[model samples]
Target: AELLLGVNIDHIATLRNARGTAYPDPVQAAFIAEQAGADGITVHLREDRRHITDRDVRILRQTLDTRMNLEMAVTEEMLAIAVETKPHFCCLVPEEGGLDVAGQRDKMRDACKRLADAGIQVSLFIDADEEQIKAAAEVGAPFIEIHTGCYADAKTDAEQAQELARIAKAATFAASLGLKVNAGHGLTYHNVKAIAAIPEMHELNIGHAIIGRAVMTGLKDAVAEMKRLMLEARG
Candidate 1:
């Protein structure tokens, strides 16, 4: 079977922040996407306070029918806040450079252990590298979501192929360590299908491409189209 898709509503929150009001509520957006057949809702809260506020996590947990996944860096303050709110799962991401440094970050083992101690299922986000997976497992995290931006934005076939090999190797290693592997970051309509074939990738948390395309083709249509493509990819 294919990886499950976790729709992200961070962009909706971005619009809300821009207007400095609740017109484009992320909670409502999450509900809409859930109703539209999203398996899960993923939100990233940054230290920079860009989008996805602390309050949104509360509303999402209180409102959504699907699982709620909170993506944040493993910072002491953030972890403390996230633990209080207690979403379904807390994804431990590298907050050093934000999403732009997708593949350039490493998951701190101690941080993962700290989140796990707080009773949150921790998932480390790291480059598709074997050492990263080993570090994640050593920290006692249950899952790891490999960053695929480098692979997606590769300018040449050789680059793409090398990236794929890296991801495949990391996924396999993580699975051997008894970790459920999920992948995302820079995944798009054209290339997501290939990642879904890794079998070990238990889920795909995608946002930009799907929602960006939604602007042109409508949200429901965009999700449905991605759904169709994912099914074909899994097969």
Candidate 2:
């Protein structure tokens, strides 16, 4: 009966980096999204430092009033940043040539425990695969984000239905294992409602689609419309 919205501001940084100008600082954009009533903010501090930089994460951590979800690859370099940044939440995601949850089982557990010791919650971002979901719990993460790309990017209606069911069951099983369930990646206004209503689904962290929509409209309205869709499906 309840859900929260997370607006990933990486795309805002992407646009800014594209021109190498300070025109669109994610902090200013984050302020607009926060004012738009986003429950949380997300940014992936990739190892390559492709889009968002350390400066962006640190600045937002201090400036934003809402929770900040830090999406990071499992690395000592990144882990060190999280320890210092102390984001409200850290999502451990797979990276290029990197291991999956099960492959990096020990690392995830240590990351979870270490980050947990700092009183920062950890979430493992994995696919909707049942074993992957189960691996997340085994790795000791308190939360898990079921990747919704397949469901949202399905080629056929029947394929989408199949992927959605897999995600639904994955969410259900994660809830049963005492893990907080979250979903992200590729979620859009078109496909967000169904996953927003999935059992025990707590939050949806969407970016590219919302930023793409914001290009045609505005950031505030884009966030608002997505939340409206999320709420519309809840009750």
Candidate 3:
């Protein structure tokens, strides 16, 4: 199957917030991304109201023609908002620190169950690890988006290859458990192809890299170029 690309437009809101004005609206950016062939849109609504806001989520829910993946921490507040807005996919992410699968096991499981029962597809944003994959399945989240920062940040070719192997291995393992494996974080135009080439990789949620390029190239062009790269890799 062709790899799916979910473009995150949170930074558009970040830029708009810088001037405390309404220009560079994330909703408008999302429309362009979808028009540019993005399979989905991802956004993170932090507790600090850092970038994305509740207004953004609500407007996106009403406007986006494609899927919406909401990245959020596992908490009552987030869950409440998710249930209310009801995005196509709700990706549960850690509030801080690394992926401590053991620590958030039960809490994650419960949250997943609730979200799943709410008829929202639950996805866990976790590191590429065998245990984390297994735990994700146990939590009843059908989708798991592996963190690819380690691979993207690798300073050496050898380290990059190793991280690639790790991600591939984890993806294969997760697939064996009947879980859909996705990848994201730190993925760029140059490095995204390898990750997208993994047969088991179902989708990728990318933000910073595309938004950075949007600084020079427009958002539509950046998203289209990224999609082109992903398709080239898949081919």
Candidate 4:
């Protein structure tokens, strides 16, 4: 299956915010990435006002020609903003880590319903757990991004194999649930192919690795290389 690449340009905003300067705009980065063949763009607007801002999401909504995925927490404020901006995609991930879908069942359902009602494709970023996938479908999220950090951070061959198995199973189970599946987090040039090879995987949302590589190589080169690797993996 052909996999899509969603470039997360949040770190570009991080770089700009470091200097408090207007130079390196995430919007411009998104434009460049799209021109370089990114299937979509991803940005996480944290509640702490870190990295991508409301202004960034507003302009990105207007500018990006391809998909614009807004990664946000399940909160009333984020929901209101998402309804207003209505990016192409909205992925609800936990602020810290771990999916508390059961804990936030009612609120998540309402929030996802609101976004879906706005014609936004709602997704949940959760661990590779069967219960989480079921809960995601229950909450009306049509998509789910399975976290692969454990696989990416695996220390040994045995560990990597085990994590990969978990991700693969999760992708399959999510698909069986009629949810579009994506996997990401801590994926790199070396470690991405395995995850990319997952048959049910639809897209991969990647950030830090590509952006960090862009510091040495150019952004387009990094993205292109990543895309090439993903395609090669699928082949």
Best by lDDT: 3
- lDDT by residue (tens digit), candidate 4, 1-235: 3799999999998899999999699988898888875899999989997889988888888899998899988877888888988888998888624577867789889888889899999889889888888888888889989999889888999999998998899889989989999977889999999899998989999999999998899899899999999999999
lDDT of 3: 0.89
The Cα local distance difference test for each model comes to: 0.78, 0.87, 0.89, 0.88
Candidate 1: tens digits of C-alpha lDDT, residues 1-235: 4468888878887877988988678777777777676788999889887988878877788998988888987677887887787777787766512222223334365556666777777777777877667766766778888898888988998989898888888899889999999987888999988888888988888898877987688777777777778878877
lDDT per residue (tens digit) for residues 89-152 in model 3? 9988888223555567888878888888788998888888888789888877889889999999
Q: Give residue 96's lDDT in candidate 3 (0 to 100).
A: 22
List runs of model 3 lying over 4 Å from the truth.
96-98
Once fitted onto the true fold, the runs of candidate 1 whose alpha carbons sit more than 4 angstroms away are 96-110
Worst 10 residues of 1 by lDDT: 96-105
| 1 versus 4: better lDDT goes to | 4
Comparing 1 and 3 by lDDT, which wins? 3
In model 2, pairs of residues that clash are none
What is the Cα-based lDDT of residue 67 in candidate 4? 86
Quick one: ranking by TM-score, best first? 3, 4, 2, 1
- The TM-score between candidate 1 and the true structure equals 0.90
User: What lDDT does candidate 1 reach at residue 223?
Assistant: 77
